[PDB]
Amino acid sequence: GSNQNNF
Ligand SMILES: [Zn+2]
C-alpha cells in the first residue's frame, strides 16, 4: 500500500 505523513 501507499503512505502519507502530514506533519
Ligand atoms: Zn506499501
Amino acid of residue 1: G
User: 3 CA distance to ligand 1 centroid (A)?
Assistant: 7
2 CA → ligand 1 middle, Å: 5
Experimental method: electron diffraction
End-to-end CA distance of the chain: 20
Q: What is the DSSP letter of 7?
A: -
Q: What values do phi and psi take at 2, rounded to 5?
A: -90, 155
Distance 7 CA to ligand 1 centre (A): 19
Grid coordinates belonging to 5? 505523513
Cα 6 to ligand 1 centroid, rounded to whole Å = 17
Per-residue cell: 3: 503512505
Dist CA 3 CA 7 (whole Å): 13
DSSP code for 4: -
2: DSSP letter:
-
Distance CA 7, CA 4 (A): 10
Distance CA 7, CA 1 (A): 20
Q: Resolution (in Å) of the shown entry?
A: 1.4
